[PDB]
Amino acid sequence: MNVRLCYASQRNEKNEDLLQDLRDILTEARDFNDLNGICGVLYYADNAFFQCLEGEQEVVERLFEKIQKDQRHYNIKWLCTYSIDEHSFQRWSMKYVQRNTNIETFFLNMGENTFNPLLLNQQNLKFFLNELLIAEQTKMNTVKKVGMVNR
């Protein structure tokens, strides 16, 4: 049973070094996800995250349980889990997308004046996931593998 799981979270503003945290998150995500057959997308803007995970239900659920404990974010808002009809984010172990004009236009047109994904509801994910799929990935210059960031 392949599923898609989506959540939004607040970035832990206590962590001053955002750039190192984002590079560390993507290094860890891409290595673990590639090994465990998970793909998806991570959006960051306005001190908040949106993530979608795709893959085998048990692995996705165990990964989400781990992410919920991560020091780097808090106030996790679980949006949905559902059986996948197509593997939309197959191309990325973990795609990274930041604020772009299409996403800013989406938020403003529905009456939000911030781009914080905690403001999204499940119906918005129709348009928002499509925007994350078509967005140019944001390049972040991450070390080649997770072993390089520890010991």
4 touching ligand FMN, by CB under 6 A: no
CA angle 148, 92, 126 (to 5 degrees): 135
Residue nearest to ligand FMN (CB): 32
Q: How many CB atoms lie within 10 A of CB 113?
A: 7
**Interacting span for ligand FMN (CB under 6 A) from 59-67, 79-87, 115-123, 134-142:** 59-67
Q: Identify which of 116, 103, 122 has the alpha carbon closest to the alpha carbon of residue 4.
A: 122
Q: How many CB atoms lie within 10 A of CB 131?
A: 16
Q: How far is the CB of 110 from ligand FMN (least distance, A)?
A: 24
Return the percent helix, strand and coil in the chain, to nearest 5.
Answer: 40, 25, 35
Q: Smaller CB distance to ligand FMN: residue 72 or 77?
A: 72
Please identify which residue in 5, 27, 49, 106 interacts with ligand FMN, judged by CB under 6 A: 49
66 touching ligand FMN, by CB under 6 A: yes
Binding track, positions 16-45, relative to ligand FMN; x by CB under 6 A? ---------x--xx--xx--------x---
Q: How far is the CB of 103 from ligand FMN (least distance, A)?
A: 17
Contact 99, 45 (CB under 8 A): yes
Q: How far is the CB of 114 from ligand FMN (least distance, A)?
A: 18
Question: What residue type is 133 in one-letter code?
Answer: L
Count Cα atoms within 13 angstroms, Cβ side, for 128: 30
Q: Which residues bind ligand FMN (CB under 6 A)?
A: 9, 25, 28-29, 32-33, 42, 49, 51, 53, 63, 66-67, 70, 72-73, 94
